[PDB]
């Protein structure tokens, strides 16, 4: 299946390329950079959402599923992009955002008018408690309550995300039909698949029970916010009504998912989705459940990474399918977060890439990951994301569960905007992103980190990624082989083995700044190896003295 063998490149289009000079990346800009992506070697593009939206959550608050936001272009520009993707032998996946819409979507503008409106039951409306307060103690992921009051009609509406992202009512069959008609509209025009935004949230517990009260916080995000009673029923209905009618790929964004849930979504026999993004490996550097959420930082712990990635590799080894990612539009640059982004930036970027691309699953490359883009030193006032604005207000100003200094430090490590500063094309003004003024500043280190310098340097992170993708297309063991963690207890080295039809692939990566040692276990000592890739210049893999961030992948001969 082409989706098993794919390498996906995720574009965050407002930050990719600005062809028309307004500072906002656009769909013709994407078209003009497709040759670059094909030369890297990715065969599938996932576009973050370009549908009409007032941009409260930068496109994830959609106000029209059948038209583009004007700064991206028009549907004609989108149809051309689909065509240009296909002319290059590639595929395009769009972002399906159907847990919620914008409050400016015509559906919601109508819903909120009156209880008798035909759109009233497209959304989730509930009476206040007798004292006027919210139906329950559920929280929003972007801080505060999940409920907002509408004075006109005397009810609250639910939003798991912002107050400008009212949640759709999937109990109403008319809403399910509306979603399936959106999907067919785009698929009939050549969209090859969907990345499904917060897909585990679409089914609600319609009794809306309170969470057990904590004492540490007023609003709670927990187990009712996902995996509702009708979740898999709905995904199975979407497959029958839509996905089964096209040659397509689907990936669900699945924050909160564990390995058994992943098998419910991804086991082919269940006729749901092809794969999902879990957050469990993204969650290793926060406390389990602080009121400060992901902003309650912990240092990188390689043993925690090895345990989580291994549970996923073994859990979906012979049923379902994994996604493989360290970066996306919601995550910091991994080398800044967990590694060295200075003197060992190249070695480190290549080392995290080798850990990831040596595994079973579909790899995702976030725009700029392939040139080693890094987190930004911009001051807090320059950040754009509503998530930061809302968390500063709740955690620092109001509840005082984080100090100013601690919050600033956490945002410098994990703010989503580190992913969103423009793609770095060359060393000229605004890194070649725009001839105008970019919507957020370009990262201050762009003169040293960009596509131009990368293509001029044979030792670039770019060529290393290009090689990993080539290897994947040449060596079927990388796609189909099983997985075994080796040297499990080593606190510096992530090593593992893939096996397929009597061939072995050995991946050994020192995720640390200091020297380390890998010794092959006893069963492998009489293997002969050929080195397929390494991030140091100078094949006896039974014993490897590893330099800082040294990575090597060998195949048995
Ligand atoms: Ca533009």
| Domain map (residue ranges) of the chain | 1-101+173-481, 102-172, 482-557
Q: Which two tokens stand for residue 403?
A: 């100090």
Strand partners, 92: 45
Q: Is 24 annotated as a binding residue?
A: yes
> 426 CA distance to ligand 1 centroid (A)?
18
CATH architecture of 102-172: Alpha-Beta Complex (3.90)
Nearest to 58 by CA among 67, 69, 46, 66: 69
Q: Which two tokens stand for residue 247?
A: 């040659």
Q: Which two tokens stand for residue 393?
A: 């207000």
Place of tokens 């009121």: 291
Spatial contact of 126 and 133, defined as CB atoms under 8 Å apart: no
CATH class of the domain comprising 482-557? mainly beta
Spatial contact of 327 and 486, defined as CB atoms under 8 Å apart: no
Q: Which two tokens stand for residue 407?
A: 């919050």
Nearest 5°: the CA angle 297, 300, 306 is 130
Spatial contact of 66 and 185, defined as CB atoms under 8 Å apart: yes
**Interatomic CA distance for residues 437 and 441, integer angstroms:** 8
**Interatomic CA distance for residues 69 and 62, integer angstroms:** 9
Q: Which residues contact 60 (CB under 8 A, 6 or more apart)?
A: 49, 53, 95, 97, 161, 165, 197
Q: Which two tokens stand for residue 120?
A: 């009233």
Classify strands 147-150 and 155-158 as parallel, antiparallel or unpaired. Answer: antiparallel
Spatial contact of 461 and 372, defined as CB atoms under 8 Å apart: yes
Spatial contact of 429 and 404, defined as CB atoms under 8 Å apart: no
Buried b (16+ CB within 10 A) or exposed e, 284-315: bbbeeebbbbbbbbeeeebeebbbbbbbbbeb
Q: Which two tokens stand for residue 133?
A: 């307060």
Q: Is 20 annotated as a binding residue?
A: yes
**Cα Dmax for the chain:** 77
Which strand (E) or helix (H) includes residue 256?
Answer: none
CA dihedral 424, 70, 107, 204 (to 10 degrees): -10
Place of tokens 């080295």: 493
Spatial contact of 462 and 454, defined as CB atoms under 8 Å apart: yes
Share of the chain residues as helix, strand and coil, in percent rounded to the nearest 5? 35, 20, 50
**Interatomic CA distance for residues 494 and 483, integer angstroms:** 13
Q: Which residues contact 481 (CB under 8 A, 6 or more apart)?
A: 360, 498, 499, 500, 503, 505
Q: Is 22 annotated as a binding residue?
A: yes
Nearest to 485 by CA among 360, 318, 319, 345: 360
> 68 CA distance to ligand 1 centroid (A)?
13
Q: Is 116 annotated as a binding residue?
A: no
Fold of the CATH domain 1-101+173-481: TIM Barrel (3.20.20)
Spatial contact of 183 and 194, defined as CB atoms under 8 Å apart: yes
Give the length of the chain. 557
SS3 at position 431: helix
Q: Which two tokens stand for residue 495?
A: 């090593």
DSSP 394: I
Spatial contact of 135 and 206, defined as CB atoms under 8 Å apart: no
Write down the catalytic residue from 84, 103, 192, 197: 197
Spatial contact of 42 and 365, defined as CB atoms under 8 Å apart: yes
**Interatomic CA distance for residues 293 and 256, integer angstroms:** 13
**Interatomic CA distance for residues 250 and 515, integer angstroms:** 41
Nearest to 400 by CA among 272, 216, 238, 240: 216
> 59 CA distance to ligand 1 centroid (A)?
15
Nearest to 91 by CA among 195, 223, 162: 195
Which strand (E) or helix (H) includes residue 276?
Answer: strand 275-277
Q: What is the DSSP string of 499-550?
A: EETTEEEEEEEE-SSS-EEEE--GGGTT--EEEEEESS----TTEEEEPTT-
197 included as an active-site residue: yes
> 331 CA distance to ligand 1 centroid (A)?
24
Spatial contact of 419 and 389, defined as CB atoms under 8 Å apart: no
Cα-only R_g, the chain: 23
Resolution for this experimental structure (Å) = 1.4
Write down the catalytic residue from 84, 103, 253, 330: 253
**Interatomic CA distance for residues 178 and 226, integer angstroms:** 22
**Interatomic CA distance for residues 95 and 266, integer angstroms:** 18
């Amino acid at each position: 299946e082409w989706w098993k063998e794919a390498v996906v490149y995720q574009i965050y289009p407002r930050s990719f390329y600005d062809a028309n000079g307004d500072g906002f990346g656009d769909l013709q800009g994407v078209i003009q950079k497709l040759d670059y992506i094909k030369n890297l070697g990715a065969d599938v593009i996932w576009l973050s959402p370009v549908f009409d939206s007032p941009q409260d959550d930068n496109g994830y608050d959609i106000s029209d599923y059948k038209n583009m936001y004007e700064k991206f272009g028009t549907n004609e520009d989108m149809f051309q992009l689909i065509d240009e993707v296909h002319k290059r032998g590639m595929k395009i996946v769009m972002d399906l955002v159907v847990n919620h819409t914008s409050d400016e979507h015509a559906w919601f503008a109508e819903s909120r008018k009156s209880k008798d409106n035909p759109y009233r039951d497209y959304y989730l409306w509930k009476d206040p408690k007798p004292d006027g307060s919210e139906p329950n103690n559920w929280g929003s992921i972007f801080s505060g309550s999940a409920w907002t009051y509408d004075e006109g009609t005397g009810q609250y509406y639910l939003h798991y995300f912002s107050k400008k992202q009212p949640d759709l009512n999937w109990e109403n069959e008319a809403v399910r039909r509306e979603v399936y008609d959106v999907m067919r509209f785009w698929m009939d025009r050549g969209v090859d698949g969907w990345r499904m935004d917060v897909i585990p949230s679409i089914s609600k517990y319609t009794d809306f029970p309170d969470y057990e009260t904590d004492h540490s916080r007023s609003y709670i995000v927990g187990r009712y916010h996902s995996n509702g009673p009708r979740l898999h029923e709905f995904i199975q209905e979407m497959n029958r009504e839509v996905l089964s009618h096209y040659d397509c790929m689907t990936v669900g964004e699945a924050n909160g998912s564990d390995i058994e849930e992943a098998k419910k979504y991804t086991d082919a026999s269940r006729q749901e989705l092809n794969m999902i993004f879990t957050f469990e490996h993204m969650d290793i550097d926060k406390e389990q459940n602080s009121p400060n959420g992901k902003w309650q930082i912990k240092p990188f712990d390689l043993i925690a990474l090895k345990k989580t990635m291994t549970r996923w590799q073994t859990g979906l080894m012979n049923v379902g399918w994994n996604t493989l990612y360290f970066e996306n539009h919601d995550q910091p640059r991994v080398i800044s977060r967990w590694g060295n982004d200075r003197k060992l930036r190249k070695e480190c970027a290549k080392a995290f890439a080798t850990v990831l691309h040596g595994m079973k699953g579909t790899p995702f490359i976030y725009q700029g990951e392939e040139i080693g883009m890094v987190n930004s030193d911009m001051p807090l006032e320059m950040y754009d994301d509503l998530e930061i604005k809302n968390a500063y207000r709740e955690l620092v100003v109001e509840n005082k569960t984080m100090s100013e200094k601690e919050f600033v430090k956490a945002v410098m490590i994990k703010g989503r905007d580190h992913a969103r500063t423009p793609m770095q094309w060359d060393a000229g003004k605004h890194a070649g992103f725009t001839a105008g003024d970019p919507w957020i500043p370009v990262n201050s280190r762009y003169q040293d980190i960009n596509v131009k310098e990368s293509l001029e340097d044979q030792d670039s992170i770019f060529f290393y990624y290009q090689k990993l993708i080539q290897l994947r297309k040449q060596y079927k063991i990388m796609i189909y082989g099983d997985y075994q963690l080796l040297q499990e207890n080593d606190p510096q080295v992530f090593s593992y083995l893939r096996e397929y039809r009597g061939e072995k692939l050995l991946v050994v990566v020192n995720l640390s700044e200091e020297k380390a040692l890998f010794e092959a276990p006893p069963e492998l000592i009489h293997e002969r190896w050929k080195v397929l890739i390494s991030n140091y210049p100078q094949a006896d893999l039974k014993s490897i003295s590893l330099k800082p961030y040294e990575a090597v992948m060998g195949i048995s001969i």
